[PDB]
Amino acid sequence: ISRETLHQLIENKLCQAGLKREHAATVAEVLVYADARGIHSHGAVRVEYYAERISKGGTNREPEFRLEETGPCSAILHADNAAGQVAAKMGMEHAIKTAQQNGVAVVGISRMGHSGAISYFVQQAARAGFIGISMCQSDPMVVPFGGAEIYYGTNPLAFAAPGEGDEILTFDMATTVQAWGKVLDARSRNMSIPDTWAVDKNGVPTTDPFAVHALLPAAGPKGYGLMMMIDVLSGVLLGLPFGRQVSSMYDDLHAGRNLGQLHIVINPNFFSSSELFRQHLSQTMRELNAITPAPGFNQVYYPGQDQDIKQRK
Amino acid sequence: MKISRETLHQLIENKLCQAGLKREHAATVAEVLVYADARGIHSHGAVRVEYYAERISKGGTNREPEFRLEETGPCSAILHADNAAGQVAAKMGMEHAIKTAQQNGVAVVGISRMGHSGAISYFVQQAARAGFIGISMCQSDPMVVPFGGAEIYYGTNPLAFAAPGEGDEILTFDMATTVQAWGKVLDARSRNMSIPDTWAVDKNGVPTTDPFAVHALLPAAGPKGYGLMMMIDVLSGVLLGLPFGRQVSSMYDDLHAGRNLGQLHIVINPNFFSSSELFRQHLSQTMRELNAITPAPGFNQVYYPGQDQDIKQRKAAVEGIEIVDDIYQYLISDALY
Ligand SMILES: NC(=O)C1=CN([C@@H]2O[C@H](COP(=O)(O)OP(=O)(O)OC[C@H]3O[C@@H](n4cnc5c(N)ncnc54)[C@H](O)[C@@H]3O)[C@@H](O)[C@H]2O)C=CC1
Ligand SMILES: NC(=O)C1=CN([C@@H]2O[C@H](COP(=O)(O)OP(=O)(O)OC[C@H]3O[C@@H](n4cnc5c(N)ncnc54)[C@H](O)[C@@H]3O)[C@@H](O)[C@H]2O)C=CC1
């Protein structure tokens, strides 16, 4: 199964499902990217779900895109509930163009569907020679630190920066202890789950994933603050639903998700030598790899290197 | 020892001018330290004055910095700080970011070659008081193992955020990227007391419950804090062409030498994206709704992020700021260090 195989497979199915071929090819690209890195939970597995939402109009197959520039370094892509992968990619293209010319770009994606493993979009920026940051809202699923009711979602944050040649450092994290898609992956095989992952309906940590009501924020109050930040930057900033108002995947397959995403792109030229920047990123990656491992680890990886390796295999 | 804000400020300002800083630089430095103490961030409060005085005295902090604000684009700049006091340089840089975001919507401003700047949420609060979103981050003394590692590379590399609500309301969030800040290991050293095994590691990279056996801190949330401190080093260090990672200076390396630290501010004007009135209403709504969430057993209340410190700060304005008595005794002395 080659990368070109599934792309064409997914491109075909989604195009049959309603999307323009170009929109279908893009969603395909992002899904193929995800499987390889062990983020299978955002890969070809979701194709059938996406195909459905497309069929029923809960994802716009004919979006009226409007890129509204708001300043020399800012814009909003009004996405009309297009597939998140298409909308986020398109907005990142604008962010890259803007940072290329004017040094920095802050671009909001306003009203999109699920955009997936969001490190795909920051890799776009790094491939263009720039620093990329991205973050987005997600289905309410997480208790506030100390709480028993859900408010924010798993609200991810991603970052990538160019090293020398084709090297890129890519980092991508959910703001919960663990992503949701391995609570079900441990709900499939009847396992106990660790008590750090989730709480019951009373907000008490649980080992029974069938009694899981909500996820816990990573590092307690810190993950809590981070998912708040992401909600404010990609949601409140754009005047979108926020916090517990954010839509859930299964609320209404006929209704647009109205999610927000925010890209920030920085051109190293506008700060220092890009050649030295890239040299120093590669040096960072080398030096971290050479760090003495602690007992229990065979090696130290630079951030994201574990996924970089899985992708190549 | 509870003391008021005007008096703690005056004392710190006096002691740092005595060391050799200009009075207005000392005032700014004092401003940021009393802010930290009032919010309960004591490890970046008045406790640092004695250290600051020695470094100013010995020339490791520039009492006569040649500031140069290099504007690099419509929304970008670098304040070359010539190893000025960190509080002075970071605030100065944030003033430019605010001006820039007012006019052009967004600002990304580096602080290039500064001393320690303290509790960095001070700077993002500047932005929020101006009606803007503020983000800041900076490099710190190498002290932390990479995830899976047994050697030091990054520092406690903090991240701070603030956004305005209605009226005078501000939502402020401010975190070290380690499990715990270094001051908690130091506090355990003062009290002779077992620390949890999740904070820190010995010289072999084995977690230790003995604060005197600590060689390095662990990153918050394993690989996630690791990635965050990397991001911060790249954004506030590598991006600015500064020493990075393990190259970053340590506080007691050379008291006669400039720290050469970096910090990065990012400021976003909500008016360039949507209704700023609705934005502020929505921040205030966020704060109210979170505070109203049903608490888990054990907790009396759910706080919105940073609310614990807002409460301490509110209590500080009434009852006064707490500092350790020995710091007061140093401040009213003629002794510098
Ligand atoms: N609504 C949405 O679109 C959402 C998407 N997501 C995505 O799901 C994924 C979730 O990721 P997590 O489960 O939190 O990832 P994770 O916990 O497995 O790892 C986080 C980061 O640290 C790196 N890392 C992990 N172990 C490492 C090691 N031993 N050495 C060096 N680096 C290491 C990873 O490569 C990754 O960059 C992300 O791609 C995220 O974008 C997550 C939540 C919501
Ligand atoms: N070189 C430097 O300048 C450095 C400065 N620092 C500073 O030191 C401080 C480090 O902070 P940490 O020890 O990580 O803080 P922390 O762990 O006590 O809490 C971090 C954040 O979460 C909030 N929070 C904590 N508990 C909460 C609760 N129950 N409910 C709601 N919110 C809660 C806090 O208000 C704070 O905003 C920061 O002010 C940071 O700027 C840290 C490292 C380096």
Author numbering:
A (entry chain B): 3 to 315
B (entry chain A): 1 to 337
What does the literature reporting this entry say, word for word?
In this study, we determined the crystal structures of E. coli (S)-ureidoglycolate dehydrogenase AllD, which forms oxalurate in the presence of NAD+. This structure represents a metabolic branch point enzyme during (S)-ureidoglycolate utilization, which is the end product of purine catabolism common to plants, as well as some bacteria and fungi. (S)-Ureidoglycolate dehydrogenase AllD belongs to one of eight clades of l-sulfolactate dehydrogenase-like superfamily. The dimeric structure observed in the asymmetric unit represents the functional unit of AllD, consistent with size-exclusion chromatography, in which AllD eluted as a dimer.
The structure for the binary complex of AllD with NADH (the AllD–NADH complex) revealed a binding pocket for a cofactor NADH which is localized mainly at the inter-domain interface of each subunit, and further stabilized by dimerization. Specifically, NADH adopts an extended conformation and is located on top of the central β-sheet of Domain II, with its orientation perpendicular to that of the β-strands. The nicotinamide ring faces toward the inner side of monomer, while the adenine moiety is located at the intersubunit interface. NADH is buried in the pocket such that only 10% of the possible surface area is exposed. In particular, the nicotinamide ring, which acts as a hydride acceptor or donor during catalysis, is located on top of the N-terminus of β8, and its position appears to be stabilized by stacking interactions between Pro158 and His44, with further adjustments by hydrogen bonding between its carbonyl and amino group to His116 and Ser140, respectively. Notably, the pro-S face at C4 (i.e. B-face) of the nicotinamide ring is exposed to and accessible from the solvent, suggesting that this face functions as the putative substrate-binding site. Compared to the apo structure, the side chain of His44 moved out by 1.2 Å, accommodating NADH and forming a possible stacking interaction with the nicotinamide ring, while Asp174 rotated its side chain as much as 4.0 Å toward NADH and hydrogen bonded with the hydroxyl group of ribose, adjacent to the nicotinamide ring. Additionally, the carboxylate group of Asp308 moved approximately 1.0 Å, forming a hydrogen bond with the hydroxyl group of ribose adjacent to the adenine base. In addition, the NADH cofactor adopts an extended conformation, which is clearly distinguishable from a bent conformation usually associated with other NAD(P)H-dependent oxidoreductases.
